């Protein structure tokens, strides 16, 4: 069970560990990332009992110059997220086949979440869709209606094409975070409970795959062990 949120204080994360949570993701939505924040993430993760995987995020830049610079800044960190309602950057983001999870098709667009050609290209390039929840807690009633209509449309377009889905709260403060049983009961309320469990299983397996990829000398899934001829 893996959450995606930002780190502010230690008591909030100590409350997170005491409930159910085994690990989470530190969320860098900025262009200024250094090793000091990641060392503070190490300190708060070793504070009580946890492991945290850090990522980086970009919003509203060019088409594929952004793709090259995003690869160059991605070569330092573990995982990544690209958010944006623009379809033009979304096509390149699902085309570059190296982004793990994808967010924001509903609030920058306000028309429809995922296109059919977009969902078929995501099936060929294996990019996952991340569903946020802070968008549900900063809107009005009919806005909640249109947003959950978009999520149910995206849920069908991910179910029929077997597109991987990761749920998160996309939190910002101490109290924006919610329970994992709550998110499981909500995704049970929407369509199905087995797919709700599959979302959490995929959320664990994608971080497991990124950790197993960047852990040792693994290139295109090739494991190399004792007595290497490494230059």
């Amino acid at each position: 069970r893996i959450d995606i949120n930002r780190i502010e204080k230690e008591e909030d994360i100590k409350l997170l560990k005491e409930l159910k949570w085994n690990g989470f993701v530190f969320y860098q939505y900025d262009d200024e990332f250094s090793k000091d924040r990641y060392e503070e993430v190490k300190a708060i993760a070793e504070s009580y009992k946890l492991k945290v995987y850090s990522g980086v995020k970009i919003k509203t830049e060019s088409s594929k110059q952004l793709r090259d610079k995003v690869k160059k800044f991605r070569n330092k960190c573990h995982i990544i997220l690209i958010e944006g309602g623009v379809l033009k950057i979304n096509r390149a983001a699902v085309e570059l086949h190296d982004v793990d999870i994808l967010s924001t098709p509903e609030l920058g667009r306000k028309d429809s979440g995922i296109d059919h050609v977009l969902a078929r290209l995501a099936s060929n390039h294996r990019v996952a869709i991340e569903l946020n929840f802070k968008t549900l807690l900063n809107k009005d009633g009919y806005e909640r209606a249109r947003t959950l209509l978009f999520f149910r449309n995206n849920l069908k377009l991910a179910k029929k094409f077997d597109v991987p889905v990761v749920i998160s709260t996309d939190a910002e403060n101490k109290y924006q975070i919610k329970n994992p049983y709550d998110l499981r009961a909500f995704l049970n309320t929407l369509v199905e409970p087995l797919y709700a469990k599959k979302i959490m299983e995929t959320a664990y397996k994608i971080c497991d795959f990124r950790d197993y990829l960047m852990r040792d000398n693994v290139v295109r899934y090739g494991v190399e062990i004792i007595k290497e001829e490494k230059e």
Partner: protein
């Protein structure tokens, strides 16, 4: 006298008891909790779902709380608990601890340690 017999348990409503907490440093009255949970249970259920899942708060002394539910729809009540966003100057936080069929068992699993029985003594003494 105005008395109504309890339905037999093959015909009565199958119920569950959700134990939860309203996390904030701020304070609340139990009537404010009932008002916010009625507004939220409307905002997630309508008339149809509120007839479906039978919401009623039974206990709120601390920021912990106990509320009653139908048996088939505890996930709906939890999803009703998630969509709290704002109450007039501020949010409140609703965080579920668990769900059980009675008070003596849900009181000891997450809430406390001992098993109290107060309804019997307030019925027989008063």
């Amino acid at each position: 006298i105005e008395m109504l017999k309890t339905l037999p348990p093959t015909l009565r409503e199958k119920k569950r008891y959700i134990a939860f907490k309203i996390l904030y440093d701020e304070e609340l009255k139990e009537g404010e909790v009932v008002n916010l949970i009625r507004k939220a249970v409307l905002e997630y259920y309508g008339s149809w779902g509120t007839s479906k899942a039978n919401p009623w708060l039974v206990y709120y002394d601390f920021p912990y709380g106990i509320l009653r539910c139908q048996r088939d729809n505890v996930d709906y009540v939890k999803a009703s608990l998630i969509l709290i966003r704002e109450f007039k100057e501020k949010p409140v936080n609703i965080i579920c601890l668990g769900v059980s069929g009675t008070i003596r068992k849900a009181k000891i699993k997450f809430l406390g340690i001992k098993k109290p029985k107060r309804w019997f003594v307030i019925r027989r003494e008063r």
